[PDB]
Amino acid sequence: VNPTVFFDIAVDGEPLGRVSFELFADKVPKTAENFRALSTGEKGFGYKGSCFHRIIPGFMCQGGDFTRHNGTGGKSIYGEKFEDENFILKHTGPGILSMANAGPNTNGSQFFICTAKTEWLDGKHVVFGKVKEGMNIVEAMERFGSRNGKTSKKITIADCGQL
Numbered sequence: 001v002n003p004t005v006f007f008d009i010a011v012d013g014e015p016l017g018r019v020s021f022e023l024f025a026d027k028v029p030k031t032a033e034n035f036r037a038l039s040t041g042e043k044g045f046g047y048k049g050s051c052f053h054r055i056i057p058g059f060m061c062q063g064g065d066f067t068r069h070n071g072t073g074g075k076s077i078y079g080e081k082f083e084d085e086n087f088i089l090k091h092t093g094p095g096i097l098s099m100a101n102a103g104p105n106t107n108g109s110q111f112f113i114c115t116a117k118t119e120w121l122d123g124k125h126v127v128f129g130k131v132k133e134g135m136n137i138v139e140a141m142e143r144f145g146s147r148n149g150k151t152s153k154k155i156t157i158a159d160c161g162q163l
């Protein structure tokens with residue numbers, strides 16, 4: 001019953017590949033639903049056309065700012081920000097999908113995809129999914145990242161939706 005969504009990733013406007021995610025609605029339904037709806041665009045806004053603004057090889061890829069496009073923006077389907085739903089799931093390894101934030105209870109739309117175990121984020125960021133297919137695409141994305149996260153090419157979500 002867990003939903004699956006996809007991102008079609010582009011590099012400077014040319015196709016890279018598709019990353020698909022399982023969303024763990026069975027443990028974090030509110031957080032899963034936010035990501036699902038932002039992926040379909042059914043609220044009239046969402047991830048389509050937004051970029052991955054911070055990519056740190058060996059760590060994570062971060063995106064989701066569709067309002068300001070400067071790493072500070074984005075919003076949830078619940079108004080602006082929402083509470084940390086729970087911290088049941090941990091940052092256990094490559095492929096983990098988790099909410100970016102600016103402290104407790106500040107979930108919007110920004111998210112990150114781990115490429116490693118990042119246990120120091122446990123209890124601070126809500127884990128709500130995992131890459132299902134296309135981890136090789138996430139690994140390809142890392143080539144365009146850097147130590148401080150600035151990307152060397154424009155890495156965009158050209159299209160996205162629910163499977």
Ligand SMILES: CO[C@@H]1CC/C=C/c2cccc(c2)[C@@H](C)OC(=O)[C@@H]2CCCN(N2)C(=O)[C@H](Cc2cccc(O)c2)NC(=O)[C@H](C(C)C)NC(=O)[C@@H]1C
Pocket residue numbers: 054056060062070071072073099100101102110111112148149
């Ligand atoms: C532009 O907006 C600034 C961001 C300040 C810059 C943070 C920064 C810069 C370079 C590398 C890193 C962090 C590495 C080590 O960490 C991540 O990439 C982590 C990895 C998990 C996802 N993530 N970033 C996050 O969730 C971060 C967590 C964070 C915030 C502040 C300082 C810090 O060291 C880490 N939150 C943010 O990026 C948020 C946005 C979600 C609105 N921005 C903010 O809070 C303020 C307003």
